[PDB]
Design a protein around this ligand. Structure first.
Ligand SMILES: OC[C@H]1O[C@H](O[C@H]2[C@H](O)[C@@H](O)[C@@H](O)O[C@@H]2CO)[C@H](O)[C@@H](O)[C@@H]1O
Ligand SMILES: O=S(=O)(O)CCN1CCN(CCS(=O)(=O)O)CC1
Ligand SMILES: O=S(=O)(O)CCN1CCN(CCS(=O)(=O)O)CC1
Ligand SMILES: O=S(=O)(O)CCN1CCN(CCS(=O)(=O)O)CC1
Ligand code: PRO
Length: 428
């Protein structure tokens, strides 16, 4: 990583040209060059490259991936003053707290909504159960009721969760990674409803992000499910669209997993102060968020001063109604295993090559912790050993804060040995 410049990674569905404009302003004002990139699969590439001390100075993703990055030692603790923290909503800071430490700057709150074509469907269905009948009517007019991305479990989760599916059981502020909720009666009911839609030819198992976006924006389908980043392309499409609450299932709200788009600082970056400068004083300003939002809408931004304006938009009100019906995702390391397992279950069941029950049974075990935990007594001994070692051997306070955060998340002797090695390898 090159000292004296910033390299920033952000997903290709976000307002990266807008962010590059913020980068250009930073360079104009400070002399420091900013390069924005949008690599494919960056949520998988970041851990790969950062593990060897490489990669971007700043990484943007929803917060759910960030506990894994932090636990792996890839993220510095961020250092905003209390005065800066007060400029963002408290509920957003909780999404980016890991083992007591702030690990990223929250940018914006993302929840899926039902997006509908008002010309085809002036009053969109309140319930999932209404959709088959609606699709039959629209099929007789050469249209379809609903198309959305069936390849990414983010989009199907709101239906799986509606009647009781859950990721990890959450009690007394803690997630139990041995207690997974993807093959309970509610998860089965929701995924069965989706698979039935496909069986009855109301949806196609092959539908992906591009296929659904193209169909909605051409007026071929009456409804889609998507986030605020999608509104830009609909605005130029001519479709007269609305954004509303997701349909209920078995009388229960759809419960989207809510993401907070967040910006973390690579632990190996020699540019941590520049990164803080850019994020606090350029990006998290009304002007900076406007530039990104104008490119692709962010959703409900974390910066109070700008959200006061955006919240007046009915599309943002709908976003936040859906967010309130769902749940802020956990940020725990096990989230990537969860998402891979649910991805597999939905694709395999939707393709008809496996039953819903078998798909979700496999996912239930595949999402859960694979390795055993140490006993409570042994684990406390390992943690106290490492805390002593960090204080003994690591002179830099920021580096100590990072390692102390990682200590909080070890689960077994192998984790203890792995983290001990990382501490012993710490450079000056
Ligand atoms: O599908 C699983 C995927 O869900 C979320 O990714 C969202 C992301 O949060 C949105 O900002 C947008 O980019 O759509 C993605 C869905 O394709 C999780 O954040 C991600 O970790 C998980 O793999
Ligand atoms: O929060 S409490 O601990 O009080 C009850 C939590 N508990 C979780 C599991 N679901 C099963 C739904 S179903 O999938 O079986 O319908 C019921 C509610
Ligand atoms: O935060 S980063 O990881 O990017 C680099 C932080 N780094 C720590 C060490 N000090 C030495 C001050 S001096 O006495 O050498 O001037 C410079 C700043
Ligand atoms: O020192 S402490 O009492 O806290 C725990 C020491 N204890 C030694 C035995 N191994 C068994 C795993 S294995 O070696 O059989 O793989 C677990 C850890
Ligand atoms: O949800 C709505 O109704 C907004 C109004 C303009 C475009 N869609």
């Amino acid at each position: 990583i090159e000292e004296g410049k910033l390299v920033i990674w952000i997903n290709g569905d976000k307002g990266y040209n807008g962010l590059a404009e913020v980068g250009k302003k930073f360079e104009k004002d400070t002399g420091i060059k900013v390069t924005v990139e949008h690599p494919d699969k960056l949520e998988e590439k970041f851990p790969q490259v950062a593990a060897t001390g490489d990669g971007p100075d700043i990484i943007f993703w929803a917060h759910d991936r960030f506990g894994g990055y932090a636990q792996s030692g890839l993220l510095a603790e961020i250092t905003p003053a209390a005065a800066f923290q007060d400029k963002l909503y408290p509920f957003t800071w909780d999404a980016v707290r890991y083992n007591g430490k702030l690990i990223a700057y929250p940018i914006a709150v993302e929840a899926l909504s039902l997006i509908y074509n008002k010309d085809l469907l002036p009053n969109p269905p309140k319930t999932w159960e209404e959709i088959p009948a609606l699709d039959k009517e629209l099929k007789a007019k050469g249209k379809s009721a609903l198309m959305f991305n069936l390849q990414e479990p983010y989009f199907t989760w709101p239906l799986i969760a509606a009647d009781g599916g859950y990721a990890f059981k959450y009690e007394n502020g803690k997630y139990d990674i041995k207690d997974v909720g993807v093959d309970n009666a509610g998860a089965k009911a929701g995924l069965t409803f989706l698979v039935d839609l496909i069986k009855n030819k109301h949806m196609n198992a092959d539908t992906d992000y591009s296929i659904a976006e193209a169909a909605f924006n051409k007026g071929e389908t009456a409804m889609t499910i998507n986030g605020p980043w999608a509104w830009s392309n609909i605005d130029t499409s001519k479709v007269n669209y609305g954004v509303t609450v997701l349909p209920t299932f078995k009388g229960q709200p759809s419960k989207p997993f809510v993401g907070v788009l967040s910006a973390g600082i690579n632990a190996a970056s020699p540019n941590k102060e520049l990164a803080k400068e850019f994020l606090e004083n350029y990006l998290l300003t009304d002007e900076g968020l406007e530039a990104v939002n104008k490119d692709k809408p962010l959703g409900a931004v974390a910066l109070k001063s700008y959200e006061e304006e955006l919240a007046k938009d009915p599309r943002i009100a709908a976003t936040m109604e859906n967010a309130q019906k769902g749940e802020i995702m956990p940020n725990i390391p096990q989230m990537s295993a969860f998402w891979y397992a649910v991805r597999t279950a939905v694709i395999n069941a939707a393709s008809g090559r496996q039953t819903v029950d078998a798909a979700l049974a496999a996912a239930q075990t595949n999402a859960a912790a694979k390795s055993s935990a140490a006993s409570p007594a042994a684990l406390s001994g390992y943690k106290m050993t490492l805390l002593a070692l960090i204080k003994e051997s690591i002179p830099n306070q920021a580096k100590r804060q990072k390692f102390e955060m990682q200590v909080g998340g070890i689960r077994n002797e192998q984790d203890f040995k792995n983290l001990r090695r990382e501490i012993i390898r710490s450079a000056a």
